[PDB]
């Protein structure tokens, strides 16, 4: 459970998945956005970087299995419930979409034009992207005589819970040692 | 009973500085937010603020809406102070004002950009002042369906050239006050 | 005297004539360049900002008459004489560029043999010009007109020959009563 | 360690970092000069260094010149350490790039199989070249001219395998027996 390996990977993930990430966290969150375009650009950047991860990462990474034993990312949006001037009820509605690698690979990407991604920011509490990545620590392949395999449970949160006109973008990564699943490491062929 | 949350007033002001101040770095330069040292950057900053107001519906991430100004109309007021024309020039200062309605900004091309008002003579310019009202709702602390209180933001952007040193100091002031919502529409909402 | 007006103007001049000036000085010098392209771009930027000063400045400025009652900027270069590669012989070449020379379309000065620098033997390039400015806060109260003459100098120092050129901006302000002189935008 | 004009050695090394490290901010990131988090950035930074060496003549503001290697032929060496795919489990490949190879249009070297890196088993890439420089502040009087030989080395360090490559720039200056090579003028 090498803290350095867990930590060094997280920094690299912030640079890969957070559009415009300056290199240092802004406060408790990694960065923020103040406009609808920047919010959409940041959400779509994270998704497109996951899709193309194979040709981006400089690590010994691979896609990981999710709760259903499938590879892909989940996108959740929490909105205040609407009704029939201020058309909002305090009841929160949670919508989710699972995007498989085939869905992202499709040309044109039909997911971008979905009604799910037409956000209503005036009643939006947050958007949460979540995906799993499997990585190997090669500094222990020769030491242990069996590679230290890690499972990263990555989560990107676009928190708009303040409703102050700024969205705080958080990047969480939970690493856990695991056994090898014989999953393909991006670079190897 | 005090009902204004300082955090909500201040968090919104930070966001307005990002929306209306062109190139705003994220932190204030000194007592003023940012400065400009050329005529182009000065015009670009003036025009950026007006165009951001115009397109606010598609920019803001808050629960905002346009607010009725001092005289009950919708829109933003631009003002310029300048030493009156003379042989190199009390009441030596001349104050010209211009009220731009939502329809004036919506014309494509906005005819306001080509106005003689916006042809500034920087050698005798004291300052330019942009002023507009925004209404906002704190959803985190309403906890009620009807009777939502709204923060009335009395926003002002000042382009101070009173020093005449070659630098224009850009200030952003925002005065929040709790008020009745009074039937004004929240940008992303529909029925 | 009004130090604030002298210093506030120097800050503005650094933003107007120093290409890419970040807003704060780098060390004792304002900024530096590490390539020939950046060095040429910085020299030409200063000159072109002088030429177009009328449509750039936010102050109450005007061009200043040089020591010999002339309008324009002077550009001086210091190159080593053809050495090995006397103590040391340096070739100090100068060019005076009048406002009519800068106004000529196309600018023939850019294509001059003067501006074909040999950086391996270049000690420095120095751009110098005069600007006259008025402090309108001295006319706000009484009717006494306080005028200033700025003796501006931009120096591209390659005297170390270490691969970096240090760019210094000096400005000497002197209170000299104006004589109904031309100010940008006045009619 | 004699005739230690430390200022000249260090002033040149700063300028080298600006010429050969792509996007170098002006100050080192930590113990290394800068880092890269994507394969495209890693390739752009590698190729930027090589292309700046190729065009050094039209870039440098110093009194520089190319330096000869043990080969007695001017050029840069690129080395890559990879884990053997499958006592030594590391594989070291090295190439030399002549100035004629860099000068040919189109540069055929960019499209070579040597430059198709497998980042999952890559430990590091190392560009290494020699540059000769003269300190003109010691020839002024026509007495004793000091010639320096800079043994520059850029390292793209992926030994952590954490997804970030640390870029180190080294420069070893030595006063040598001045063999007055073309000083780009």
From Swiss-Prot, chain D:
Cystine pairs: 79-94, 147-178
Keyword annotations from UniProtKB, A to Z: Adaptive immunity, Calcium, Calcium channel, Calcium transport, Cell membrane, Disulfide bond, Endosome, Immunity, Innate immunity, Ion channel, Ion transport, Lysosome, Membrane, Protein transport, Transmembrane, Transmembrane helix, Transport
Localization of this protein: Cell membrane; Late endosome membrane; Lysosome membrane; Recycling endosome membrane
Primary localization class, coarse: membrane
Domain of life: Eukaryota
Extracellular topological segments: 2-185
GO biological process, one term: positive regulation of macrophage inflammatory protein 1 alpha production
Region Extracellular/lumenal pore loop: start-end pairs: 22-38
MF terms in GO: calcium channel activity; identical protein binding; iron ion transmembrane transporter activity; NAADP-sensitive calcium-release channel activity
GO cellular component, one term: late endosome membrane
Manganese among keywords: no
Job of this protein: Nonselective cation channel probably playing a role in the regulation of membrane trafficking events. Acts as a Ca(2+)-permeable cation channel with inwardly rectifying activity. May activate ARF6 and be involved in the trafficking of GPI-anchored cargo proteins to the cell surface via the ARF6-regulated recycling pathway. May play a role in immune processes. In adaptive immunity, TRPML2 and TRPML1 may play redundant roles in the function of the specialized lysosomes of B cells. In the innate immune response, may play a role in the regulation of chemokine secretion and macrophage migration.
Self-association and partners: Forms homooligomeric complexes; probably tetrameric. Can heterooligomerize with MCOLN1; heteromeric assemblies have different channel properties as compared to the respective homooligomers and may be tissue-specific. Interacts with TMEM176A.
Family listed: Belongs to the transient receptor (TC 1.A.4) family. Polycystin subfamily. MCOLN2 sub-subfamily.
Recorded domain comment: The most N-terminal extracellular/lumenal domain (referred to as I-II linker or polycystin-mucolipin domain) contributes to a structure with a four-fold rotational symmetry in a tetrameric assembly; the structure contains a central highly electronegative pore with a 14 A diameter. The pore is critical for Ca(2+) and pH regulation. The protruding structure formed by the I-II linkers may contain all the interaction sites with lipids and proteins in the endolysosomal lumen.
Protein's recorded name: Mucolipin-2
């Amino acid at each position: 459970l090498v803290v350095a390996f867990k930590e060094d990977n997280t920094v690299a993930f912030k640079h890969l998945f957070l559009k415009g990430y300056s290199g240092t966290d802004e406060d408790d969150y990694s960065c923020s956005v103040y406009t609808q375009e920047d919010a959409y650009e940041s959400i779509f950047f994270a998704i497109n970087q996951y899709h193309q991860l194979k040709d981006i990462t400089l690590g010994t990474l691979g896609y990981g299995e999710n709760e259903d034993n499938r590879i892909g990312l989940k996108v959740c949006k929490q909105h205040y419930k609407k009704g029939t001037t201020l058309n909002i009820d305090n009841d929160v509605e949670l919508d989710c979409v699972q995007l498989d690698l085939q869905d992202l690979s499709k040309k044109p990407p039909d997911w971008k034009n979905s009604s799910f991604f037409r956000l209503e920011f005036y009643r939006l509490l947050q958007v949460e992207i979540s995906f799993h990545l499997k990585g190997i620590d090669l500094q222990t392949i020769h030491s242990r005589e069996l590679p230290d395999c890690y499972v990263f449970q990555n989560t990107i949160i676009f928190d708009n819970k303040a409703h102050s006109g700024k969205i705080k973008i958080y990047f969480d990564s939970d690493a856990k040692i695991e056994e090898c699943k014989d999953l393909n490491i991006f670079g190897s062929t």
